[PDB]
Amino acid sequence: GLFMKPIFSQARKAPKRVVLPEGEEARVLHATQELVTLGLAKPILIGRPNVIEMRIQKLGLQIKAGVDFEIVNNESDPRFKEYWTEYFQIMKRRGVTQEQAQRALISNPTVIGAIMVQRGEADAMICGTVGDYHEHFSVVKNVFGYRDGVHTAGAMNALLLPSGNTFIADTYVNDEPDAEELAEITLMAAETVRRFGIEPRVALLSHSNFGSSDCPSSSKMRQALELVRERAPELMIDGEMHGDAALVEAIRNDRMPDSSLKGSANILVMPNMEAARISYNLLRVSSSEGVTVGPVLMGVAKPVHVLTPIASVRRIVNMVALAVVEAQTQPL
Amino acid sequence: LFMKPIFSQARKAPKRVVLPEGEEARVLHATQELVTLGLAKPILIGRPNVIEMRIQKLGLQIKAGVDFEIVNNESDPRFKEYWTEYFQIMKRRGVTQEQAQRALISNPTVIGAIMVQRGEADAMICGTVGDYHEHFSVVKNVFGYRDGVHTAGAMNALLLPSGNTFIADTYVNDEPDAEELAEITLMAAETVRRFGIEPRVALLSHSNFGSSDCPSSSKMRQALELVRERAPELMIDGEMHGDAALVEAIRNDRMPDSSLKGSANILVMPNMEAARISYNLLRVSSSEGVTVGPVLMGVAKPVHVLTPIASVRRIVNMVALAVVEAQTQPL
Amino acid sequence: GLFMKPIFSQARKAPKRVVLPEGEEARVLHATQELVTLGLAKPILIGRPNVIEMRIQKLGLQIKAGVDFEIVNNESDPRFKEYWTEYFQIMKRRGVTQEQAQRALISNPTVIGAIMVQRGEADAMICGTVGDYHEHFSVVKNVFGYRDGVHTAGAMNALLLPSGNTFIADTYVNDEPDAEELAEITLMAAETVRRFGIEPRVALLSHSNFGSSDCPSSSKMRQALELVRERAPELMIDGEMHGDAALVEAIRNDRMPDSSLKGSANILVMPNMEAARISYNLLRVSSSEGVTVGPVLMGVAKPVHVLTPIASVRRIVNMVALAVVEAQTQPL
Amino acid sequence: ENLYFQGLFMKPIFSQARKAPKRVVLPEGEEARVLHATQELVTLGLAKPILIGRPNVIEMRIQKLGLQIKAGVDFEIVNNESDPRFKEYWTEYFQIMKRRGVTQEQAQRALISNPTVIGAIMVQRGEADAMICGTVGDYHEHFSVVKNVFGYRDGVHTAGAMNALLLPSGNTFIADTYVNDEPDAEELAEITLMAAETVRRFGIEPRVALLSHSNFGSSDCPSSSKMRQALELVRERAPELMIDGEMHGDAALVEAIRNDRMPDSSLKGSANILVMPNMEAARISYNLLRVSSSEGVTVGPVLMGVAKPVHVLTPIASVRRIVNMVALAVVEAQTQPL
Amino acid sequence: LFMKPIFSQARKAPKRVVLPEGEEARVLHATQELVTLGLAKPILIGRPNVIEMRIQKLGLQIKAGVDFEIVNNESDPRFKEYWTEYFQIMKRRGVTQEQAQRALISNPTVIGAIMVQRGEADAMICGTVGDYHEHFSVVKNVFGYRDGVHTAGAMNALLLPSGNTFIADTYVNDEPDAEELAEITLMAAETVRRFGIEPRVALLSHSNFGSSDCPSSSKMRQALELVRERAPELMIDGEMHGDAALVEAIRNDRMPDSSLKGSANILVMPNMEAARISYNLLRVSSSEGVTVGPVLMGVAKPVHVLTPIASVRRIVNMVALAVVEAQTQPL
Amino acid sequence: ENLYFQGLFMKPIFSQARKAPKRVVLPEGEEARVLHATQELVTLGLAKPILIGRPNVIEMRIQKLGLQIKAGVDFEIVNNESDPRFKEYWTEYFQIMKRRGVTQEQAQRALISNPTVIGAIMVQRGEADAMICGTVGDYHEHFSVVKNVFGYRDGVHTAGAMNALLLPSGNTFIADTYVNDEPDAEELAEITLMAAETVRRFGIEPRVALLSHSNFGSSDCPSSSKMRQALELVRERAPELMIDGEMHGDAALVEAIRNDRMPDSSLKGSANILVMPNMEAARISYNLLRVSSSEGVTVGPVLMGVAKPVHVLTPIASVRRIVNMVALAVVEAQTQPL
Incomplete structure (x- = not known):
């Protein structure tokens, strides 16, 4: 930490x-x-x-x-x-x-x-x-x-993982955020991490691997990404992708060799709170080694x-x- | 092994x-x-x-x-x-x-x-x-489908610090209903019995024991009810946090007299998105080799x-x- | 004649x-x-x-x-x-x-x-x-x-196409009937033609050719069929199929060789009233030879x-x- | 002609x-x-x-x-x-x-x-x-x-299929018969213009009819309204184009029938482009019309957009x-x- | 009169x-x-x-x-x-x-x-x-519709103890949305000006100033925001109970700063059911009499x-x- | 009395x-x-x-x-x-x-x-x-x-609140006023029964009226059918109970008004129980009547279930x-x- x-x-x-x-x-x-x-x-x-x-x-x-x-x-x-x-x-x-x-x-x-x-x-x-x-x-x-310029709020929790220090999307505020809500949370999460001294490397997660499913969730994550690219054109972000691809550059190069996401993502934006808290919960008691911050409330x-x-x-x-x-x- | x-x-x-x-x-x-x-x-x-x-x-x-x-x-x-x-x-x-x-x-x-x-x-x-x-x-x-079964489910195994763990559904149903979750739970439980392991089911949700009234939590609670009638002998409880499922000490502080004892070895999740992202992130962050997965059931x-x-x-x-x-x- | x-x-x-x-x-x-x-x-x-x-x-x-x-x-x-x-x-x-x-x-x-x-x-x-x-x-x-046992009404119109006397339902009452309403209409239409002293040969029509599409319009016709076959196993019916498959035996026999329907269908049951009326209106002024009956009210x-x-x-x-x-x- | x-x-x-x-x-x-x-x-x-x-x-x-x-x-x-x-x-x-x-x-x-x-x-x-x-x-x-x-082509956000028939009243085109199951008002308006300019290239004057079981406002169905909306959007982008609706198929093809219901209809003679509410009405109508018309066909399905x-x-x-x-x-x- | x-x-x-x-x-x-x-x-x-x-x-x-x-x-x-x-x-x-x-x-x-x-x-x-x-x-x-309006509304009168009271909308819209209610409110106020009375409006609900979150009490709160924006001169408040509308002392205990002074003479209703039933039961009960209604507006x-x-x-x-x-x- | x-x-x-x-x-x-x-x-x-x-x-x-x-x-x-x-x-x-x-x-x-x-x-x-x-x-x-x-009480799956006014017609009860916002046919049926049993315990003959802005079919809201479906359930469950609907408030309280619309209604004289379609219509009716009446209330809100x-x-x-x-x-x- x-x-x-x-x-x-x-x-x-x-x-x-x-x-x-x-x-x-x-x-x-x-x-x-x-x-x-x-x-x-x-x-x-x-x-x-x-x-x-x-x-x-x-x-x-x-x-x-x-x-x-x-x-x-x-x-x-x-x-x-x-x-x-x-x-x-x-x-x-x-x-x-x-x-x-x-x-x-x-x-x-x-x-x-x-x-x-x-x-x-x-x-x-x-x-x-x-x-x-x-x-x-x-x-x-x-x-x-809310603070000027935001119409949504989100919570970020951090875990020390083998791949590095990772942050997770709204884990406690919005149950099923919309594309625009997820976009704001993504920017607030990235801004928060820059303020911690770390370079933001963002992954929008889904079971869909870069368009492999058309369920509303995968579809909302894809819409979220463009909104983020329009508002933060200098932010390292890519998706939607599998969890394994977010953390392991090797698994991601086999799927998207020219993914603008380099290395292993430190910020993981999830499509719904059930996926975020259960992941966060299961990871903490199993794959983590000493949390530092969380829940971090943004907005x-x-x-x-x-x-x-x-x-x-x-x-x-x-x-x-x-x-x-x-x-x-x-x-x- | x-x-x-x-x-x-x-x-x-x-x-x-x-x-x-x-x-x-x-x-x-x-x-x-x-x-x-x-x-x-x-x-x-x-x-x-x-x-x-x-x-x-x-x-x-x-x-x-x-x-x-x-x-x-x-x-x-x-x-x-x-x-x-x-x-x-x-x-x-x-x-x-x-x-x-x-x-x-x-x-x-x-x-x-x-x-x-x-x-x-x-x-x-x-x-x-x-x-x-x-x-x-x-x-x-x-x-x-098999006789008496109207839904299919995939189940992935992991060796986590808390022992062997199974996650469902991971690949077939995106937003399974209560009856579908009730069918997947029974299938998963018997699948784990054939491996020579006592099945210990935890239905998961951000909701911890009635804390949230979103459709996902109700879905899991209705699912628990249907699984109770169909298998009175199966060790199952929920809906609960992932942390309470794996670590007894945390579960006892929330719900002392839960029928789930020790650590839960089967984790039934609310939506495929939850099931796969959980699995994916745990597989690469809790490296302990591979065994079975994705096990198709029904x-x-x-x-x-x-x-x-x-x-x-x-x-x-x-x-x-x-x-x-x-x-x-x-x- | x-x-x-x-x-x-x-x-x-x-x-x-x-x-x-x-x-x-x-x-x-x-x-x-x-x-x-x-x-x-x-x-x-x-x-x-x-x-x-x-x-x-x-x-x-x-x-x-x-x-x-x-x-x-x-x-x-x-x-x-x-x-x-x-x-x-x-x-x-x-x-x-x-x-x-x-x-x-x-x-x-x-x-x-x-x-x-x-x-x-x-x-x-x-x-x-x-x-x-x-x-x-x-x-x-x-x-x-409604008559006893019936829970819906339906109108039937008649055309002389090359295939012979050909009836269409529902053309005027139900704008978008459900699987149950179509099932009853089909049975009413069959007995109306049987009473005119004609062999009822029914085709449930769609843009889907025996499952080519999964739109809720074509599913409805697939369910209407099951319901009809349970209630009148003697009646000659098949679906869902294209209008050309209903009327030309070769087009159908090539797609569904074991079709229970033989020769030209003489009752065309339609998924919605829009499809029903537009088809009749266009056919009535194009295959214009003569008709004696319609709209025949049933139920x-x-x-x-x-x-x-x-x-x-x-x-x-x-x-x-x-x-x-x-x-x-x-x-x- | x-x-x-x-x-x-x-x-x-x-x-x-x-x-x-x-x-x-x-x-x-x-x-x-x-x-x-x-x-x-x-x-x-x-x-x-x-x-x-x-x-x-x-x-x-x-x-x-x-x-x-x-x-x-x-x-x-x-x-x-x-x-x-x-x-x-x-x-x-x-x-x-x-x-x-x-x-x-x-x-x-x-x-x-x-x-x-x-x-x-x-x-x-x-x-x-x-x-x-x-x-x-x-x-x-x-x-x-x-x-x-x-x-898609520039200025186009929907594609459409068009099929030709030779009915007694002349060469007639029907869209959309294969691409969109249920098109919205915008999609229909785009298909119309594409169908209109396709028929121009065949050296024919486009005479469009928007079809429905609603005869000029006799039903307030979702489809009937969609057509009325489509008509306005077409008259905005193509005011030179001959089009009227929403109307019955018989009124679109037979001037005499139309003149009794809408004497002042800006549609003259027999319509040669039939735009339909849904692919179901579009393909059932064409399919039945193709096998029941004695004349043969030449083009179809024309993919546009x-x-x-x-x-x-x-x-x-x-x-x-x-x-x-x-x-x-x-x-x-x-x-x-x- | x-x-x-x-x-x-x-x-x-x-x-x-x-x-x-x-x-x-x-x-x-x-x-x-x-x-x-x-x-x-x-x-x-x-x-x-x-x-x-x-x-x-x-x-x-x-x-x-x-x-x-x-x-x-x-x-x-x-x-x-x-x-x-x-x-x-x-x-x-x-x-x-x-x-x-x-x-x-x-x-x-x-x-x-x-x-x-x-x-x-x-x-x-x-x-x-x-x-x-x-x-x-x-x-x-x-x-x-007349110029600048996309909504029509009917308005009936009573003589309650507070005085000449008007209720809308009682005969045209089953479920008016926020913008429809906003328009009916401004029509009702002007009509009441033409009668020589000062418009004092209350938007009624079973919700008292935010106590309920049902879509109809939210609709009333949204209708108010619209009227305050367009017509800052109009004495209006809501959403509130009927008693709070007609009794200064009940309103003052719940909302002391309320822009509404004395008893409201215009009672704007969330739906035709709440309006007609209220009007119907008050007419037979309040007795007395009125010379106007139903006044069509728009x-x-x-x-x-x-x-x-x-x-x-x-x-x-x-x-x-x-x-x-x-x-x-x-x- | x-x-x-x-x-x-x-x-x-x-x-x-x-x-x-x-x-x-x-x-x-x-x-x-x-x-x-x-x-x-x-x-x-x-x-x-x-x-x-x-x-x-x-x-x-x-x-x-x-x-x-x-x-x-x-x-x-x-x-x-x-x-x-x-x-x-x-x-x-x-x-x-x-x-x-x-x-x-x-x-x-x-x-x-x-x-x-x-x-x-x-x-x-x-x-x-x-x-x-x-x-x-x-x-x-x-x-x-x-x-x-x-x-809940045995054989009851819904709670209901009832207020009482002394209106010129006589002691009049209104439900539901505080528990359910949009009660369904089944809930309105159980509320009607509980409302009647409460009025009987007070030693009063219960005379029920299901209220709507529809006068016996005038309107086909989901609300109108809801009241009409609730009437069916109550009539079967309690044939002894004097009830009718759906009707306007005036018809409910004033015989002469009801006789002109529906000459042979099951409801005689003046209704003392007014059953409302939604809490909105219920509380607003009660609140305006309580303040516009010169007679004081004695009971309310009476919880049931x-x-x-x-x-x-x-x-x-x-x-x-x-x-x-x-x-x-x-x-x-x-x-x-x-």
Whole structure:
């Protein structure tokens, strides 16, 4: 994960305030300790100070409130009225009553952190250590919106594979994206990887090997590729192709000797989420050797990432680090 | 090697297997290895001169009419009996008498399927050249489905860190319905029993135990229900993440009392796209050699369609399976 | 050379009362004179007696309202209440108010005729010398309904091609019938020709020659065949095939040597009404020799036929004759 | 003029091919019917024929039929199982079809077992001027090779087939009978203009009718509307062209019938181009009309909208047609394709 | 009453109004009131025999030829020009010369519409007999939509406790799309301006400001975006419950910033079912009474289609309304 | 009579409740309207209330409202933030929802953070007899939990909500108003039966009318047939029930209007049950009638089909409605759920 090394360095240059809504989690508190020691961020945890301070003394951590990290009590906070008032303003015509907004800013810590970032009291947020992705992504898309020039959002997960470090298409946001949606995700994935210091080498995957099937999926991947070629004529990309051809140049030269994709692709764009998560899932527990980033959320208008319940202390740290560099420039 | 049981069972009662790509370097290399180990009595299709010429250039010992039989796709007296039968089958399916005559000359798979169907051959291994669907169409049209089975499915094996693993459907159905997934699961489960392995099925989806209400997840859950009634004894559970299927520790944190115990060795997927991309990426990233694949299930005669990038070992293994399949009953 | 000869003969032996809703039409008055002269039917015209008796003079005809043909005055009749009350009893829950039913039985002669036939004050009806086919058909379907065992209606037209007398269905009712509707039409058409004393030899037509295409139009014909063979294993039928394969034995014998169909098919069943009408219209004015019958309505539970506005004086006489025989026997 | 009379419209076509014969490939060069046509083609001096097939099987059949055409003297034979330009051919076919589900291995086989691909590649390379194929097989087997290898003409995004009949009212053309199962409003409008300009070249005035069971708006079916839309698009791009619809077949062919329903119809006399809603109505109508008309046919199926002069025919196509469609294809190599 | 400024403007310039149903009793009472109050110059249609025969039995004082004209549907010297213009309009819409000829004898609404198109009349009031859509078909076909509009809509009035309330669309479109609703809304607002009332619109749904995601509540939200874009001056809000539309305090608790002030007077409905059922149940329940409805909007001539149960008062009120449309422009 | 009178049909419900008071869970225990309602319930001896919320906040309000009810004495408070049954509660919820996208982690959050789940589990376990909820938020927010935990009654595969208006015609009920958006023929049939059984329990003769914008066939929507197909199912399933349709609202409520259209309808006098084709037409009709009538509501929304005595209310519910709906829910527990 050498690509995380430059991010740790950039984050320490200008540490940013990062909200962590699940502040009573053992994995989150450990990461808060590491982030303070590394000096990459100024952590803001959300929860009951009774449960936070106690579990800190059960795990033996030096971090203390008011000094190393800020605590926001979801059950009591002078900023409550200013928060539910802003959430209502944003969701009043989206099914949220003043009462529904109030309950949210008390028992939904993801909404509290999102509103903090939206107000400007926080510069970034890392959530999803507990729950389901859409429980948290719904809130982030609703409060922050998309960034100028994008009408879709996607998630990218990375795996260290024998062939190299590989990234996978929307693994958690869109179930069956359309050609235009896939095109935007492809550009956002490529832009994200260039920002990690790596050259983007993109493969659009299918069971169709360069036109061998006419199913709507293979057909949508082919449409996606031209849209990408029109908008990014200098980006290394080719498809649609088999997985094996994306990773092994040899297998690809026998099928498309003059494929503009050189070497072994580092970015793999999938046609549907079922193919992406199952591949990502099966690869991680079998063919991978130490993930670094993921799930990387691209296209939201604020620096934010939703994670998964199995997210390790190293991932939370790495994703916070990434989100700080995100807050220094422009959201991914 | 889980193949040994297969090779040994083959060796005891070897059966006639048609290899329609008789002129292929790989098929000749395989024919010699099959005859040395006494696994199958091979029949190759192609030009006898071209086969005998290439047997020489490759330094091979097998000789025709002695170790193997050749069927000249251009010159054979049975030509009239073959196109006549393929026409009887395909006359209402857009195949004319004239098209049926071209078919039994320039399509080795049709020749090879009509052979198996007439009992002049017991099994067939094809696909080392061309598109999977090109060959499968012939196979399905000529042989039809087994009794009680209304769908076909392909299954590929892998040696992953979690042990042997099978993925379906990988080549026949793009978006199989619940009944099709229920039929593929039962077929796959019994196929794995014949290899001498306890079948441990996991139906997969991005959805983890009711987490998503997309049509794919429902499809898998309706599929689980149909498989429960039909096989109360089969170890199966879902719909779940791939990670929970292979790693018990992860599954126990989500669903402690899942009827799936240990690691799942059969992974039934929602769509071909998921099945192949998963397989393709795991095959090159978890290199541990090759065994079986793509194993065809639910066809009335012993037959398997393969890939152009198939190796000599795979052809030898799949022929060996096809022989055991010719004995006993089709998978 | 008249296949109508057997039909007329049987009509003349026991004439039946036939309603002609377009009683004021020139062609219908001519047809009544001819029908009375040939003693085939006891006619019942509908319209203003003032206007019927006037143009019977102007056309120098020798028929009278006393005995020759009974007249039903639509603007005045002592059976008015009983009619609209019956028409309302049928259509009360089908969108027709009492007021709408009272107008129908004054200024819709096809509805008057339909109710008359339903009440048994007439045995058969011929209509559609004016207006659109469905205006008249929907009235006939509503009041009469389908025959027992039948769940659809169909029109059949006749041509003299070189191959012989040749019938086409469905030409006017179902615009795109399903496999089940085609199956019933085929069986109705076979018995209609069998009743004309002709061997029914059926071809289901398509642009697909025995499976050359897998369009949902040709599949429909393939399924219609199965359904027909189960229900009438004696009937001579085959399909789906080209029109040239249906009519020329050599073209078919070369493609399908064991075809159950022999010589020329004399019933051409069509996948859609577009194919049906365009074929007939083009054939009727190109293979123009002469025809006596059509459009022959089938599946309606009373002896009724809807004609076109271009129907000749003989066509009306012919169809009236045919209608008399179903009345004597059972409806087509 | 010559629209009422039999095959007169094809005298200029023979006159123009005789003046400058072009090279025409006949992929099914081992078919008895094709061999007879080559002879008459050589005899009438209409085209320099190029057959694809096994040289032995062709000659054996030339002597068996009693033909005096001689290999290397009257025509050229391209051996499908042997040719020194075999590598150059599969190389160009692969470059066309690499992204369309054809491997390098599959490309090689096609240029040895598919004579229509061999022939298409010949014409695309300029080693032949035209091709006449599909005397054996299915129209779409051949057409999809034609389309893939050649593409459409400029300003055209759909191809169409047109078949001629000699009905009592005169020479009449029907489209689309073989390429599009259900064409959309745009596709129909393109086919119409192609059919119109094809009939112009035959030295006949195009009189188009859009056919339907809907007589000028008597049904609001999806097909009826498509035709009304097609009519507007045609009147936009070709306001000089005589066309009306949508109408019954009888009204299109018989002026008297039409005048009763639409006196002011901009269609005058009898229509000679019948454009239909779907391939089902198109082929059932032609098929029945061809066997029920007593007069014979000359051209069909005329492929329109492809960037090289090519026609795919039917297995029941007579020896005379093969000659008349080659003659047409030669005039098409000179001049422009359609 | 808001009919007084209308009744007044009618007396200024009484115009020619075709009442197709001249043989009906309710239309005959109404035409007497029209000449007495001097609102329109009636042109009734039907058999002059049964008109005078019924004028007497009803006991009326209207002199045929002096007070009102009779156009005999059976015998008229303009017949040939009438079916020709109708044929010129419906020639390509499946109407033959024979059907046109029968239409201009047997369909009074077609006679009426052609008179208005010809200029020989100024407005028409019909629908006192038969289905709404029978008459609308004719009216839509002959006249078409007015400039800038591709949608027609009917609008009924109530007197609820909040005041004069209008509901659309109740008689023309079963399922209007977002753009159709957007157009109906702007027509309904202008019509209500012409009555002298300020348009205060609510787009109704079982969804309250985003609480549901069904395609019909999404349609209403999309319809609002369209009206706000095109007509920023119009007081509108939605989608909301009917109670939120008519009770300031219920709306203020859910949407305090709402651009809608007081109780809405225009209730725009997602479909004809929700509209008619609401109107039907409120009419019988709210009681009181109204002088207008159904008001047709979007058509290129002064025309209005009524219902068979329309009172003698309505025909006079709608005729007067039509006379004002005859001056000025069509609603 | 129970019909045509204000709140008279309710007297037996209070009468019956007083005899055997049951324990009813009020998940919104911190709401003033629920605290007022709790006082009235204790004073009139209708039920043993169990509130849910922060025992601290609740106690401040019982005072800031100057009420006499006391915790542990006149009513019981279940602390959402801390309970000695929390383990078996999240466990029993997990068992129900483990294959419906709920992790053990997600369950634990919910039995602390969602009062309606705590309430649902209490009633299910048998620690409570009934539940009245939905005084805050969206209807479906509460119904989805109620459906998940309790499921349907035997021989019922659909839930339905019914509101009541005193219209000039008399007490009139409308369904479905809050559960199904586009219910099918089968669902409308089960809703009609449940609506009738509920109206009978109130001691009123059920007179049903299936409503449409079609008057007996005037229109062939999918909606019109839906109502016509629902009529067939109901007539077979319950010949005793007075019903007819599809018809306009006016015809439903006013005999003279119905007699003119359909002289011999099965429906006599005035309909008291109006069954609606879609939730859109149902809620809009009710909402506009509730505000335009001068007569107050007594019951609504009455949930039907659930296997436990439960009712989801609106946030605009008055203290009296809650008190009424709790009494109805007590009598359901003493008997069989609706």
